[PDB]
Amino acid sequence: MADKMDMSLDDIIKLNRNQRRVNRGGGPRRNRPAIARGGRNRPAPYSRPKPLPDKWQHDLFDSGCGGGEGVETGAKLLVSNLDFGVSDADIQELFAEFGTLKKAAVDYDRSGRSLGTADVHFERRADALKAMKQYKGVPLDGRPMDIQLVASQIDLEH
Numbered sequence: 001m002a003d004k005m006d007m008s009l010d011d012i013i014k015l016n017r018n019q020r021r022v023n024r025g026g027g028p029r030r031n032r033p034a035i036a037r038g039g040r041n042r043p044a045p046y047s048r049p050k051p052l053p054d055k056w057q058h059d060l061f062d063s064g065c066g067g068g069e070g071v072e073t074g075a076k077l078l079v080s081n082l083d084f085g086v087s088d089a090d091i092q093e094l095f096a097e098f099g100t101l102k103k104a105a106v107d108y109d110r111s112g113r114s115l116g117t118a119d120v121h122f123e124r125r126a127d128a129l130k131a132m133k134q135y136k137g138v139p140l141d142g143r144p145m146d147i148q149l150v151a152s153q154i155d156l157e158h
Contacts, residue, residue: 060156074121075128075152080109081145082116091118098131125153 006012035041043049052063079091088105095101104120122128132149139145 060158073125073152073155074123075125076150077104077120077122077128077131077152078117078148078150079104079120079146080115080117081140081143082106084114084116086114086116086118088118091116091120095120095131098135099127125149125155128152 001009003009033040040049043051077095079095082091086106088103091106092101092104095104100122102121102123104118106114106116106118109115109117120128120131122131128149129152132147135145136147137144
């Protein structure tokens with residue numbers, strides 16, 4: 001067997017499969033309340049734990065959080081419907097007309113080059129959602145204007 005040490009491996013099989021790693025308690029049985037270490041007795045007020053019965057959404061982000069990275073919940077708006085000479089300040093004035101703007105600068109897109117398409121950034125996702133619902137489909141010249149949300153309200157996506 002190339003062992004000459006354990007000798008009876010069959011014994012190991014039985015002993016190791018029926019081994020006990022905690023002879024100071026434990027027991028894989030559903031008889032005694034399994035508090036584990038710090039479960040149950042921690043969030044419980046006194047009567048019973050309250051997992052937030054009026055939870056508006058869910059524990060997607062958490063039951064309650066308040067952090068970030070500089071972009072705690074930044075909203076990126078995509079906009080497309082202009083001419084060519086559209087600059088950052090230009091489209092910024094535009095979405096300012098659409099509300100308090102933080103930053104908005106233009107991009108060059110699938111149409112060859114310039115078109116007015118821009119990146120609009122706000123701190124609020126709903127403001128962006130309203131933006132991408134309200135102004136989306138709204139005619140502006142011979143065609144309706146485009147405005148969609150990216151990396152913002154998409155936090156629901158899992």
